[PDB]
Write a protein that binds this ligand. Sequence first.
Ligand code: HEC
Ligand code: HEC
Lengths: 80, 82
Amino acid sequence: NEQLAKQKGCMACHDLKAKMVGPAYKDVAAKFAGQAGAEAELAQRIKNGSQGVWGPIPMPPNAVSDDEAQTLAKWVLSQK
Amino acid sequence: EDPEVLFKNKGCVACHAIDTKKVGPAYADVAKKYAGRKDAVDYLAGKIKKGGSGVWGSVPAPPQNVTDAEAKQLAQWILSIK
Ligand code: HEC
Ligand code: HEC
């Protein structure tokens, strides 16, 4: 069971559920830390889509305003 | 709006987590690979205890400090996950 697996250290290297289709936000934030233009860039990619950065599967556009996109971009980039 | 809320209501949550993936396969993916295979528990219990590499990548799994009975219990649990 989960408790035994936690106890024995297994969860340091394993999760229960498969990786999600897109990149983890801590990885996105770390890639862009200290990079000029990152909030703009990500806002654009959240709004308009992205492929080829993290894998073969595209992110489709999301229907967000330049405000919702900026908000989310800032929050993503703060994940540490 | 709060970002943790937009994360939820625009569907971002469906595709992104905060934390990075761990190095080994997810237990639900193990369960899927080995489903219906007669000797899967015994195979996994040995791997769990002794470690090994090559099945999921080049990264070797280290041996673990489990009894053979605990290794079997963990095997059975992992296979259970759907
Ligand atoms: C705590 C006792 C556990 C348990 C229950 C499991 N592990 Fe690991 N694991 C790691 C890596 C890199 C792999 C891939 C190895 C390969 O490519 O062959 C695995 C694999 C597994 C499996 C699947 C084995 C298979 O042959 O299909 C299973 C069932 C599994 N593990 C269970 C990495 C690690 C660790 C990194 C330091 C640690 C700790 C553990 N695993 C611990 C456990
Ligand atoms: C709801 C509005 C969101 C927000 C805030 C983000 N996503 Fe996604 N996303 C997905 C996939 C597969 C990728 C990788 C694409 C590639 O490999 O190029 C991404 C990528 C991202 C990023 C990083 C972009 C960059 O240029 O590095 C960011 C910040 C991001 N997303 C945020 C997959 C999906 C989804 C699957 C259907 C959905 C829904 C979302 N993402 C939604 C959002």
